[PDB]
Amino acid sequence: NSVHPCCDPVKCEPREGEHCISGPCCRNCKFLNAGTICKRAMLDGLHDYCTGVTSDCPRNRYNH
Amino acid sequence: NSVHPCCDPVKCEPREGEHCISGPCCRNCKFLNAGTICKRAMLDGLHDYCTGVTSDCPRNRYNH
Secondary structure (H helix, E strand, O other): OOOOOOEEOOOOEEOEOEOOOOOOOEEOOEEOOOOOEEEOOOOOOOOEEOOOOOOOOOOOOOOO | OOOOOOEEOOOOEEOEOEOOOOOOOEEOOEEOOOOOEEEOOOOOOOOEEOOOOOOOOOOOOOOO
């Protein structure tokens, strides 16, 4: 709903101390550990993993 | 590529003993453990988990 728990509305940044606002790899304002699977692949075993430094879910680079 | 390691081409079923062919929740011909996250959500903490009984990745029922 309304303001985000993670948002600093005077700066439009995450409140000081937290890492992010929302995302497959953002949970409770902080980054999930790098390596955490954020999506499984149809099938080759090339899954999309979290990076530890960003909120989004990266397409595994070993894909065309 | 070619025939699937998991496929029984005379029956067009998975070779006897295995569970599935391919899918986010299928790995080495077998079902991933129920509860295994197959996809993380933008943000509510309502992730899509594996079922243990199917190869696909289920939309979490707590979504509209």
